[PDB]
């Protein structure tokens, strides 16, 4: 359940994560090569998202995203180790 | 044109008094594929096959 207050609380954390993405230099450079390789597609945009848009996310946007994307055909559950198959 | 000379006493690379535009003004990208600007001669599939042959046999 995605409450508005929880999204408001997590906005700061998400923004801080986006800003701190530069700590992992290799990861930020991988995001940069993705951006430069695909300029005419949203696939080039950074995974952490556009900073100025992070504060624009609402509960409804998250709910719509999860409803329209987390579908049965998209779920793969893999198990390994000491697990009983049946 | 910007203003007075500022010496090295200002530690920050970007002085505070400069203006930074908001996110509204910056233009957004058009993240869609656009029609190719190609002439009649090169649009012919035979010419494309000739280009590929030249690329992968002599070039």
């Amino acid at each position: 359940v995605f409450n508005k207050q929880q999204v408001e609380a997590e906005k700061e954390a998400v923004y801080n994560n986006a800003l701190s993405a530069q700590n992992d230099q290799q990861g930020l450079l991988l995001e940069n090569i993705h951006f430069t390789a695909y300029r005419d597609h949203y696939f080039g945009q950074p995974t952490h998202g556009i900073r100025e848009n992070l504060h624009n996310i609402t509960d409804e946007v998250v709910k719509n995203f999860v409803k329209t994307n987390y579908v049965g055909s998209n779920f793969v559950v893999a198990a390994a180790g000491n697990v009983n198959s049946q | 044109v910007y203003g007075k000379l500022i010496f090295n006493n200002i530690k920050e690379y970007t002085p505070s008094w400069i203006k930074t535009i908001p996110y509204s003004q910056v233009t957004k990208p058009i993240l869609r594929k656009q029609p190719q600007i190609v002439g009649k001669i090169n649009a012919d599939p035979k010419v494309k096959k000739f280009w590929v042959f030249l690329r992968e046999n002599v070039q």
């Binding site: 951006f35 | 996110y23 003004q25 910056v26 233009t27 009649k40």
Partner: peptide, 30 residues
């Protein structure tokens, strides 16, 4: 056609023969 490029390009909005923006533009990389 071969000469159609000149005819089509004649209809362009350019400042004194130079294709420039009509207002300030700023681009940022996310």
């Amino acid at each position: 056609g071969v000469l159609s490029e000149y005819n089509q390009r004649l209809s362009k909005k350019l400042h004194k023969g130079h294709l420039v923006e009509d207002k300030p533009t700023f681009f940022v990389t996310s």
